[PDB]
A paper describes a structure:
Here, a 2-methyl-2,4-pentanediol (MPD) molecule from the crystallization solution has caused a displacement of the α0 helix to allow dimer formation between ENTH1 domains.
Accumulation of the adapter proteins at the plasma membrane initiates the endocytic event and contributes to membrane bending. Epsin and the phospholipid PIP2 are essential for clathrin-mediated endocytosis, and we show how assemblies are formed between the ENTH domain of epsin and the ANTH domain of Sla2 in fungi.
Numbering used by the authors:
A (entry chain A), B (entry chain C): 1 to 147
The structure:
Amino acid sequence: MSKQFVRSAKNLVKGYSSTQVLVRNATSNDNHQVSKDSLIELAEKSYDSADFFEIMDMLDKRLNDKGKYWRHIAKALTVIDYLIRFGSENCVLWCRENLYIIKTLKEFRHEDDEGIDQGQIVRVKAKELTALLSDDERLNEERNMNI
Amino acid sequence: MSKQFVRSAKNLVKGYSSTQVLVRNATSNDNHQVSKDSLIELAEKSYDSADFFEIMDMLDKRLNDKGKYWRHIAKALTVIDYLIRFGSENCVLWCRENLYIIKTLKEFRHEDDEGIDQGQIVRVKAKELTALLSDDERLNEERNMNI
């Protein structure tokens, strides 16, 4: 039967739009962090009312991932970082609502494959992130010096 | 209000089709493993392009199950074995893309409440399956002599 579309056949089954996929691509399961361009492109779609909502929800679905998928949670936090600094005000306030999800990720355990502390990058980045969040002074200044 | 038929409602509320239900029943949380009949049924329905997609996703939605459901992950693997061995070629190529889910299952931790680990049953069938999967020569010979 047909062949190379099968990658995109998957996303259709679950009903992911290209915006949901670009987030799913940005938070991939490999190691390469997030591409420099993908972030500003998600920064643009953060203003787009429809896309915006698709983005936020996908990160929350990515933040509450298993112990095994440390990289989803690793990349997700860098994405959430780029939006609160470059994207819309909508982005910051969203995080403030479900702030407990980030505070919980401070303590993430995954030293199982096969002993290496892989889940520290998750802990540290979250702690590093929410530190930037809770303060009001350092937020508004960074945004003014970006746009 | 009603009695035994309420079971079907549970599968209704989540919007499960006949095939989506047959997958969940064969790949249930019992230790009896799948039925030989249920295998060739899902192998046959694998040819049907409508059912074909439901199966893969329901097998995928069951491979990333929690620690507690070790029996789901085991049967799901042994199911994919039958389809890569008997069913439509479409199935095999599906697996080649979501190989990241298969590769990671080589290791899997499950301390078993009573004090055991199976645990390995999940680990081992994965290792044994992908080893069969990765080879191009073993596949093409296996199917031609079965059809």
